[PDB]
Symmetry: D3
Subunit: 241 residues, 6 copies
């Protein structure tokens, strides 16, 4: 029972986690607290992100409420979350259940955390946004600037070392592997703009204010420095069509 | 340097740690608790790994007991010792055996994965995924529990190492940080199979269900095809060059 | 109002007072980390101990150790002040001085390494290795305590930086994340790069072996240098080639 | 501006704590998190009790939600809380502000914690009630059995060592000092029944299923073993009119 | 189904399985504390270490220390089993055996003291004092490690119990909270009460000095005994007097 | 027994703690951190008190700095030493000076109150109340910050000690656990004033604004009237008897 078959994402996740809780008594109270006691997927996400990023400095209850108010202020974030989960199930062979990336894929956590961060930054809570950016970098190994604008349908697989700068913009239905850099090169627009459908391979660098066309493919380890036409595969250092 | 290439690994480690404990009073109770109070190397490893990966969610006592019950698989301890010896052999920055045991996160990631693999094969999949995620957070190393790892492994520096579900590694292999043993929507074998003796340089990507031959040499390269034994491949994309 | 227009410490205190007044969630944190301190170095010791403290190593003890270290070599504080200024110069994402001080893990990794180097030279090797491992865990940055780093350093984003035992870095250098200053061989001795003043290294660049990198050279992103590089040369490719 | 003068309890507490937060920068984020960010007194109470009684075993977020749902299920508990605060302001010379016992009087915390405990016990959550009873005993030094029934207007001053058994019942507007025992003497009714208005002195023992009349006064250190008529002062070991 | 109608351990495991199934908030806690263990003594060591552990003293280390202690003197476990049965006998509020095991701080204080006494006799005096202080903080109960306690003990409610260095308690005794088994004088030696089998002491009763309390005596609540008490006598008052 | 009645308190404490640290490896890093790494007794006291009373809300580093800045009042350290000597004099269970310093919660409650009193007089009332509540939770001792305490105090066992806002205690006093120095709606002086040399037995209640004379002796008694000097009072209610 999946979305490319039948469907309720939330109900399916609850059934999966109920099975898991019954199977592993070591984690049951965790799964009841993180998931089963909640009434919406967004509440679960806020709770788990607060567990990940909480500190003595930033109480987990306070961060939980902040993420809850954020998700309730911006309804589109929950839509993006659900889209990303569906994308991970579609594209990742290692994903056999929906709760799997929800609970255990640090790239998914980094992306959704950034979404909330972006919401806080736009509201003027810049200091808190920087605090959470630093904490996301520490715990997830992923540095996304709060100003970065990311679309829906994103899968950040493995994730370790992903960087996205202040002025980066990503379209919808994009797949990024670990080690990828969407880096800069004086302020202003200076970070990549990635189009819908693009797939970026592991340890690929995309530098500067350059456009990457729809359904382009950036090979693993490549270094892109100029714009890339849509539907082109570029490979090499520097990358070439 | 009374070492294995000049012997009791466990006794040597205990002597090193006794010296350290006497020297640094800030860490002595730590070294007594992690090492000196234990009767076997495997118990020390379980204790330290649980210290690293423990959380409020997962009590350190429970994780310690789980790792000891796992260590059921006596051969894992053998692999641990092998890996330690390899690190002493191959790493110039390793002058003592307790050094990687306590402070090298690549060694910790590899041994943690070994225990994880044991838990996964026994059907404790949820805990295996939980611990995989925690290994990724604390060590910066993502090894899928299904991955099959041989003995004599050295993962130096480690930050960013990835190994997918279907990856298989032989014996006496040396991997640097940033290395990717990655895949290429459809399941099945899709992660590299690395042969005994191979050396992979930093930030090297090996993608897909491809075989890497005995004593091959792969820094920064991107392999997409199989590699014959005893070949040095370099470049993006990789090409034989030696 | 910046250093190119000045007291770094006073400016940082003003910025942090503004932030504390703005965010009530973080006010006590900013008062404890910054406003209650009398010197920038004390703030640095406090924040680093907050980052790297553990149940094994009490934060009060690590704080005192970092304080005694900074007092042992006053010049370390100078380097700290240099590095902050460098980031303000070179990083477009840096609009305030307390920003990297509090939230840039590369800056924290560099200063932590400085203190580590001080402890290692004093013979506190076990603690140096402990803190190296902890820096690797929390920051994702592996710098060997023996590594020699000059002033004016910016380690942007930082995740995955590695620098071995015999690495030496000059002054006014800019390094991005994923960069490797790595070694070669099983035999000890000089085997890690020596980077000259002014060099810029792009993301995920590997520099391997006991090789010299000349003044104001530029190592392109993703490049792999295995030979020495003349001064004022841009090298690109795998392996890197002059251009 | 007090209740025996003018009045909004909640607004007054918020003003007091805003003053405190502005005065002590060491505690400001605490006072914003415990009080100023909340919309009702009951939410503040749930939060602070969760801070007190939270553990690694029992996450503070989970306990916070449990106390919130409890207070929302039983509206009378909040009324009792407000009554108790007013009683402490009335009767305790050391209470010059309303937020003072709210945040810093462990007897007040023990009483309100017990109220929530009683709610959980009546709902059948007996194991959780026992867990929280043990934790209240550890942190507050106060052992109140979850089944005990306590009225409103209670002040438990200093509190250390207060004990109240399974079948104890306390009326309204009662004042109890530290060390007081409402103890037993085979099951069944075996714990005191205390009437409205009674004042019990420090280290006084009241043992058995005995009635204590309205507006009685039990002297400090006394040991009561028989019923006490209303409006009588009893003192001694054993206590005598 | 109780011990007066039997396996204590099996009954406790059944009770805790029921509780775990009933309360999902506490299931992993009950599995870790009880169900994953193979003996009651292991459960006791685990729970006591949970109570008394700290950042200074790792819970794994304290757990191992309590385990080794219990293994050093198997008879301690017998006393534990005795005490639990006593509470079930004597406490109306006890309807299950795991109830005092998990939630009665007097039971925890008594068993903690037993292990403490074992460590003290073995010469681990510094740790014994550490754990005495920690027991005093968490349980509100001060028992000197040298104190000698028999089996069949019920310390109900417990808050404020004190027993000095030279105190000795027989078997099958019932003590309420606030009770003092205290000393007198600045000179060491025997100076703390010796209580005989069967005695019942009421809440906030003080028994001071090196005085013997006879078999099956009853010390009324709030009483202050300063002289020896004959067996099978009820004493009441301040100071206590026969009745 | 090289002691003060047979001298350097600080050096003796350091020697005792060095012996203990060498003997118990489980606590050595603790004893080095709490005591041996410090240069003065007052710093040790600030460190240990912050360890006891620290929380996630109140960082131990901040509380440590606050206690050191308080200790501004040099005389407090004198009182600390006096109290320690008293405990050695009067308590048979005290054979070493570091014993109450590290493990006697009555000593900790008294010294914590001293610092609290200093903070309260300086106007840091909110923090004083916070720390009073924490002292009540951790030590089971409720001392109002306004309470005025003399030197040479021994609070043995301590659990349940209460001292109200207007209480005043002289010098060289011995108090057992459960003792109440309580009050009796209207503010003003309403808590006992205890004279030098007095001894109060366990679970004794002294209520109201009443004077207790020099070298008076009060276990379980309830005093409601003033007590002349050099009188033993016993009973509920209390009566002179010796």
């Amino acid at each position: 029972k999946n979305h490319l078959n039948t469907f309720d994402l939330w109900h399916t996740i609850r059934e999966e986690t109920a099975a898991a809780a019954a199977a592993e008594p070591m984690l049951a109270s965790f799964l009841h607290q993180t998931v089963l006691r909640h009434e919406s997927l967004g509440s679960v996400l806020a709770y788990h992100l607060s567990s990940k990023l909480g500190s003595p400095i930033m109480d987990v209850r306070a961060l939980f409420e902040i993420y809850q108010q954020a998700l309730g202020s911006d309804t589109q974030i929950s839509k993006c979350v659900e889209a990303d989960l569906k994308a991970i199930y579609e594209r990742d062979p290692a994903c056999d259940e929906y709760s799997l990336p929800l609970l255990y894929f640090k790239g998914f956590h980094a992306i959704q955390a950034h979404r909330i961060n972006h919401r806080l930054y736009l509201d003027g809570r810049k200091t808190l946004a920087y605090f959470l950016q630093n904490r996301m970098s520490e715990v997830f190994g992923v540095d996304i600037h709060p100003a970065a604008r990311l679309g829906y349908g994103l899968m950040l697989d493995h994730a370790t070392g992903f960087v996205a700068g202040e002025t980066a913009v990503l379209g919808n239905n994009i797949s990024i592997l670990h080690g990828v850099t969407l880096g800069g090169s004086e302020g202003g627009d200076r970070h990549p703009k990635i189009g819908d459908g693009v797939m970026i391979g592991a340890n690929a660098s995309i530098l500067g204010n350059i456009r990457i066309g729809s359904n382009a493919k950036i090979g693993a380890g490549s270094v892109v420095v100029s714009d890339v036409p849509p539907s082109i595969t570029v490979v090499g250092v520097p990358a070439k069509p």
